Write a structure and sequence with these properties.
Two copies of one chain form a homodimer. In chain A, helix 2 packs parallel to helix 3. The first copy, chain A, contains five helices and five strands; from the N terminus they run E-H-E-H-E-H-E-H-E-H. Chain A has a five-stranded parallel sheet with strand order 2-1-3-4-5, sandwiched between helices. The relative contact order of chain A is 0.16. Chain A has one domain (1-128): Response regulator (Rossmann fold), CATH 3.40.50. By secondary structure, the first copy, chain A, is α/β, with parallel strands linked by helices. Chain A has helices spanning 14-26, 38-45, 64-73, 91-99, 112-126; strands spanning 7-10, 32-35, 52-56, 82-86, 104-107. The interface between A and B is medium-sized, with 14 and 19 residues. The PDB classes it as signal transduction protein. The entry lists the keywords chey, response regulators, two-component systems, signal transduction protein. The assembly is dimeric.
Amino acid sequence: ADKELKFLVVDDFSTMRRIVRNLLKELGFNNVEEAEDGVDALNKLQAGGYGFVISDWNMPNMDGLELLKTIRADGAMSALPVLMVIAEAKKENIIAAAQAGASGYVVKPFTAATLEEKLNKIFEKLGM
Amino acid sequence: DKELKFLVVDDFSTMRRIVRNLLKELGFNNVEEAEDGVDALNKLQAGGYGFVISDWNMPNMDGLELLKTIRADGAMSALPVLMVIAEAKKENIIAAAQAGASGYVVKPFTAATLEEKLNKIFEKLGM
């Protein structure tokens, strides 16, 4: 992929946002911005130029699943890649995410190697 | 350009003629036809198309299989793809977005509906 792909990392926990940012950076991706809930996320997405969204499941104001749905329903950004971050490999939560159009999901905590592999799978389907 | 070449994909020839007639009515006269996903790739491979309009259900290779094939290919990856679905099933609308569709329209539709769908796609693409 283009090393300049612009990512948005969304989590209300500042430490995790910083952790993910470090992992992306280690993978060669330095163009990353943060948001702390789905509302903040949506306000930032409107400026434009984002190519990928990495979002936690649980957040105040607007959670992960609601963030996903909004993007999926928006004409200008309906096809934006969205990787959902979840706390346990719970079949039923994973199902909720697939039903909402998630591009992929990852279980936290995760290593750089796992992140790389989940990104690479989304890239290949979208010819990124 | 009103010279942008479309590929219209559906196994029902009558629906293909309709779509081709709605395009002419909008000013687009450079239109080709394909009967299934297989036949469509066969043409897209040969080059120079600028838009795909495809039905959801077709034999051999359906609309979602076609989109997926297109999106994974180097060259054809950025081609605009408008999916035609039979009813507003939320399930289909979402699977088309997760797969990279450019837009969707519910059949039967009008020249009017079609035009609005095309303009939003051209505007988001900067075409």
